[PDB]
A paper describes a structure:
pmcPARP4 is an ADP-ribosyltransferase (ART) that uses NAD+ as substrate to add ADP-ribose onto target proteins, a process called mono(ADP-ribosylation) or MARylation. PARP4 is also referred to as vault PARP since it can localize to the vault particle, a cytoplasmic ribonucleoprotein complex. PARP4 has a distinct domain composition relative to other PARP enzymes; however, the N-terminal region of PARP4 is homologous to a collection of domains found in PARP1, a regulator of multiple nuclear processes including the cellular response to DNA damage. Collectively, the study establishes the human PARP4 BRCT as a nucleic acid–binding module.
However, the location of Phe39 on the potential nucleic acid–binding surface was intriguing so we also considered Phe39 as a possibly important residue. Conservation analysis using ConSurf indicated that Phe39 is conserved in 77% of 150 PARP4 homologs. We mutated Phe39 to glutamine and to alanine to test the importance of this region. We determined X-ray structures of the four PARP4 BRCT domain mutants. As expected from thermal stability analysis, the overall BRCT fold was not affected by the different mutations, and superposition of the mutant structures with WT BRCT yielded RMSD values between 0.5 and 0.8 Å (comparing all 763–788 atoms). Mutants F39A and F39Q both led to a shift in the position of the sidechain of K23, which impacted the charge distribution at the structure surface beyond just the F39 location. The loop that bears residue F39 was repositioned in the F39Q mutant, whereas this loop did not change in the F39A mutant, thus leading to visible changes in the electrostatic surface potential. Relative to WT BRCT (0.5 ± 0.2 μM), mutants F39Q and F39A exhibited slightly weakened binding, with estimated KD values of 0.9 ± 0.5 μM and 0.6 ± 0.1 μM, respectively. Relative to WT BRCT (KD of 19 ± 4 μM), F39Q and F39A showed weakened binding with KD values of 35 ± 10 μM and 33 ± 2 μM, respectively. The TM of WT BRCT was measured as 51.6 °C ± 0.2 deg, whereas TM values of 54.7 °C ± 0.4 deg, 54.3 °C ± 1 deg, 58 °C ± 1 deg, and 60.0 °C ± 0.7 deg were obtained for BRCT mutants F39A, F39Q, K31Q, and K23/24Q, respectively.
Author numbering: 4 to 96
Amino acid sequence: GIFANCIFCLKVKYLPQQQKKKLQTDIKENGGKFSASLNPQCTHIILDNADVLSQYQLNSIQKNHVHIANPDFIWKSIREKRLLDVKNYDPYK
């Protein structure tokens, strides 16, 4: 699937539970892995609009080349049946 070799940290606490779960199933059904925690193995961190990151988290993200994206990265990649440009979905840029 399109998310093969992707490891997503999900910070989507303020999404409806049904959307959190759809994110998870969309990731797993298309070859991805997801985690609640941020670590060096993460390739991506998905952040809903109301979730924020600490300076510590942002430094880890920079150091480990983690891509910061919003949920639309997942939704639209699934819809288009193709991994999109994550640079177009960065809430911090």
